Design a binder for this molecule. Structure first.
Ligand code: CL
Lengths: 167, 13
């Protein structure tokens, strides 16, 4: 499963209308990994389903150890098109008229699994399309052993979400 | 790669 000293990344974007569990891959820099189909959940998805999704998204997270792999993964035109494509889908699927509508109440929770620990970080919604760890104190992280039940992971995600800051 | 920053389908870790 998860390898020693290997980082696995997932981010959850939550609006009042949906919950999106997203595998991020990379190395230092990470990005939504377009290999994997999205994992969109109902905003009120139960803890266990959410936990299972998060663990699976984490399992898909790749460490781009190959240089050319990294360079290709983060190609600016490709990154730009993927993100734009990302926005388009969400807007179309949930009927957001503008990007702002999509983003204005979007929370982001970062999930990081390395070694024995899952770290769930609330974020500060600093600009419409930016979430920062600034102004989130380390103490607000939800830390869970990696072997937590899917339900505890789901519950822990909900806890972190409650700690996101915005506006 | 630390406080994280998430922007445009990317995150600085
Ligand atoms: Cl980085």
């Amino acid at each position: 499963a998860f390898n020693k000293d290997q980082d696995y990344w997932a981010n959850i974007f939550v609006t009042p209308d949906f919950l999106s569990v997203e595998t991020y891959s990379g190395l230092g820099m990470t990005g939504r990994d377009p290999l994997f189909s999205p994992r969109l959940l109902q905003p009120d998805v139960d803890d266990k389903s959410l936990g299972e999704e998060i663990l699976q998204a984490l399992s898909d997270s790749r460490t781009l150890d190959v240089l050319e792999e990294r360079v290709a993964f983060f190609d600016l035109e490709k990154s730009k098109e993927q993100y734009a494509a990302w926005i388009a889908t969400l807007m179309e699927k949930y009927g957001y008229r503008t990007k702002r509508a999509l983003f204005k109440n979007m929370k982001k929770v970062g999930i990081h699994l390395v070694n024995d620990v899952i770290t769930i970080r609330p974020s500060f919604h600093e600009k419409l399309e930016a979430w920062s760890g600034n102004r989130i104190n380390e103490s607000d992280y939800v830390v869970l052993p990696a072997d937590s039940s899917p339900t505890e992971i789901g519950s822990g995600l909900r806890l972190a979400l409650s700690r996101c800051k915005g506006t | 790669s630390a406080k994280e920053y998430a922007l445009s389908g990317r995150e600085l870790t």
